[model samples]
Target: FDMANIAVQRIKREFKEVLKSEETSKNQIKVDLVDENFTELRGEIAGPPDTPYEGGRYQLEIKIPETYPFNPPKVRFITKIWHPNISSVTGAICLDILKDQWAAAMTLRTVLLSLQALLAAAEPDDPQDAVVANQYKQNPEMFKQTARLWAHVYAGAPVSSPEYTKKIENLCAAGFDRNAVIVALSSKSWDVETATELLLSN
Candidate 1:
């Protein structure tokens, strides 16, 4: 069978298992598949409770390569997010499964669950967004606030934090370039840290 056919078949089979699982129904996590001529598979994960991402629904795009089980899918955010492992602007993810840690035995369900876990616990030490990662490592509270703010502002999630938006406004009024501000704020999520790092790096 062709690769796409194999992928479609596997997805259908795994989705049924996932839907029948008790855990998903209990948590209210919803998953949908699209048949558009996309290079990847897409799904959405409702943000979990007690999290900055809570009360919000987030979109995800999973790109399955032609190689199938021989390689892991490329998972990215379709919604704007501010995660250490995900790009705030592009939603590119930096998890190991999408990198070198993939194993052939892994399945679509495993990837979906892993992504769910990732939203619950972000790995800041190894980040796709260096700015967010640094902030996460230096000061978790501030990083969390910024992430939640982004989620609320961009993803239609209820506002959990506003400190980030306030700071962004201040930075912009201070004549900082918008992109530069985002890059700067994203890196450290702190004025002192962002300024110091910019000066040192330049």
Candidate 2:
């Protein structure tokens, strides 16, 4: 009970501070309460400019532990994103601060900003998704295009290409599930033949 009280109190403090800070301006990030206990919260972060994730607002789920800031809150993307450091299949985030790099002094605001930075500067060297990491290293342009397509298709960002879209449509028109088609295409470097093979195997 005491630990819970401390966690709740700290959240009450930092949560209010983050809400009024400059980060909240321009809608760069937004966070709000999910319950009166101050344990679960929802957060939103805008993608950094000049990146594939740019202009997209990614939703996040944050859960505060009884240990509070001493142990980083359990955080994950609720919105689908394509990034080496994030899970395309599960929306899990792989960041040091969220794990061993965490400090008690850091607030949820810090987490939000850190996530924003990660969106633009991904550490593909230490990646969460091997497939994404390989693609990012092997084909930078393809990776960017794939990320843009994910942002547009999943996060309501502006679309930049119809070629990928057309390919997905072609798969859909062939009576394949739209989502599986994209997953296959994205995983196979957008190769239609290999993508079809995955569909057939699945």
Candidate 3:
């Protein structure tokens, strides 16, 4: 079969699978395809309830290259997000499966589903944003607060925390990049006192 045809077919199968999955179906995760370009495929995921991203509509960019399947698609957050594994600069996702572990068996739906799971549970040890990961591992409360701030500002989530917002703004100005700032602050266990000192020293 042709590559394009295979890709289209895989998309259909995977999308159907997503529609059947508990998280996608129950929570209303929306996935669609476009003929405009491979550099970016648009997506809107309904934020899972009870989380910082809750009640929000997120825009995702899925970039498939000519050597797809052999390689993996590049998924990024066109919209801002506060995830450890996703990049702070461009929201580029760094997942094992999307890199050396890729297999042709994986479908587009599988990739999206993986992202959904990622949002629900962050993998901090192997993160694209080292700073955010450190913070997540060290300071749980502060991490949650910052995550909520990102969600509120970017994803249109309801709740907001001014203190968290101020911290994030300061980090952004420190030139650590969004992810790096989050990780660095998190490493200090959300203790702004120590974290601020460390940031200055570094």
Candidate 4:
């Protein structure tokens, strides 16, 4: 299809919502560098308040289609986050607004707010991969535990600090690796022993 001023107008206008005012003052939902046509752009949102995701900033990959508002922009996380959501190697979200319930009249602010809401309270529903967020929906303890590690790991954290390397040291003490240990530890719900077992076995 040919160019539609509709997509560009909507995006720049939406882009300014975070860049110039409104949410910009609050320091939450925001946009960043972009391409000329506005087909793809970077977005970012502050982690949700009173949650494990707090204190970190998550990058969002927002792609606006030529189709425009008729279908929600294809958005995914550009950072690693553990949710009862997709680890489909795509950072896909499990929220409703981006899917069947997506509205044509909405804007980037709504998507960012909804993602922030998801950071606070997850709603597990999806496409392609069904098991995403499965561990989260099933067990809240490990869910938050690993989510805490993941929330901070990718977006913020001093890897040399005891908060993490405490476990990393223990795990790698036996000749294991750092990231592998994170996978095992977080995968095992932060249980050093189980992560140990997981590391030894897998």
Candidate 5:
């Protein structure tokens, strides 16, 4: 196959398909070209309902490979999220279909849908961020609270966690980065002293 040509052709076709799909109408998923060339693209998916990410919107950076359908597109989160299967720092994902399990038949629509599903059902045991996974398994409630806080802060979800916000402000008062404070607090189960110590050390 002329990989480059096929990749462009498929992306254009998929772009049209997604534009007319019901999900697009509902604002559940979207895609856009980064340039005239079909090599780079952007994707967005609404966080799945009934999950910590629900009511949030997530953006993804997609880079098509020269191998076309034979290789999966390189995708990473542009919006920050707190998920066991997604890196809090780098926004890298740990989804199987995006790597070794990719199939030639998979389309951008399916990829976006799969990401939504990933948010709803995270595989903590096969984690991309071990600290997040540990908190998820050991303290489910705390994990939910932390994830919700992140969603509100980074994704514009309509959630207000005043207690967590206060903690973040306390750390920020000491001149620490707000995002770093959030990460430290979340990783330490919202413990102010421990999170402050972690921030100070770094």
Candidate 6:
């Protein structure tokens, strides 16, 4: 099979389709070429409404496999997100459609839509980030607050929590990575002492 040629052709077609769609017209989804070979692309999706990710724009990195439609394109969050289905540390996504549920009929449009759906309804039982999922199940309110804070900090969402911000700053002042501190705080339910200990231990 001429895998490279086939992959390039399909991606070109799908790229055009995505740009011409209503989602692109409405600023809900966007696709941009990362290179001339069509092997890599960048995607952006608006956070779905009524979710912690709302009012934010999340970026994704996509890499088309030479297998083309026969295999799912590799997709990961380039923007940090706080959700059970997405890895806050590595941006790995835990979604069946991107793996076992993938079909030749699926396109980049559907993938982005599925990601938006994931933001709306997280599957704590099947999580990419176990820590986030555990928090989601054990303390729902704290989970929501933490996710909102993440959206604000990472995705430029309009929500803000001064308390959480202060905690992050406190940790940052100690010379730890800011993003790492945010993840530690969120995972530990904003407990400064526990998060500090975890950071120190690592």
lDDT per residue as tens, model 3, 1-202: 2347555555556667766777666655655655443334676676666676776667887766666566777777777777788775678887887778889888667776677677888899888988778778877776777777777777888886776666767878866566555545545655667877776776
Count of residue pairs whose backbone atoms collide, per candidate = 1, 0, 5, 1, 0, 0
lDDT score for candidate 2 against the true structure: 0.91
lDDT of 4 by residue, 54-108 (tens): 8788898998888887888888898877666646356877666787888878998
Give me candidate 4's TM-score against the actual structure: 0.82
Query: Which 10-residue window of candidate 4 scores lowest in summed lDDT?
Result: 157-166
Task: Tell me how candidate 3 scores on lDDT.
Answer: 0.70
Clash tally for model 2: 0
TM-score of each: 0.74, 0.95, 0.70, 0.82, 0.96, 0.95
lDDT for each of the candidates? 0.71, 0.91, 0.70, 0.74, 0.90, 0.90
After superposition on all CA atoms, how large is the RMSD of candidate 4? 3.4
- Per residue, candidate 2 scores C-alpha lDDT tens digits across 153-180 of 8888897469899999999999899889
4 versus 6: better TM-score goes to? 6
lDDT of candidate 6 over 1-202, digit per residue (tens): 3347777778888999999999999988999989888888999999999888888899999988888889999999999999999999889999998889999989999999989888999999989999999999999988888988989988989986789999999889999999889978988889999999999987
Where is model 4 more than 4 Å wrong at Cα? Answer: 124-134, 157-165, 172-177, 191-202
In model 2, which runs have C-alpha deviations exceeding 4 angstroms? Answer: 1-3
Each model's Cα RMSD: 4.2, 1.4, 5.1, 3.4, 1.7, 1.7
TM-score for candidate 3, please give it.
Answer: 0.70
| Residue pairs in candidate 1 whose N, alpha carbon or C atoms collide under 3 angstroms | 131-187
Worst 10 residues of 5 by lDDT: 1-10
Q: What shift in Å separates residue 27 of candidate 6 from its native position after superposition? A: 1.0
**Residue 111 of model 3: what lDDT?**
75
* Residue pairs whose backbone atoms clash in candidate 4: 84-133
Query: How would you encode candidate 5's per-residue C-alpha lDDT over 1-202 as one tens digit per residue?
Result: 2347788898889889989999999999999988687788899999888887889999999988988788898999999999999999998999999988999999899999999999999999999999999999999988888888989999988885789999898889989998889888988889999888888897
Query: What C-alpha lDDT does candidate 5 achieve relative to the native structure?
Result: 0.90
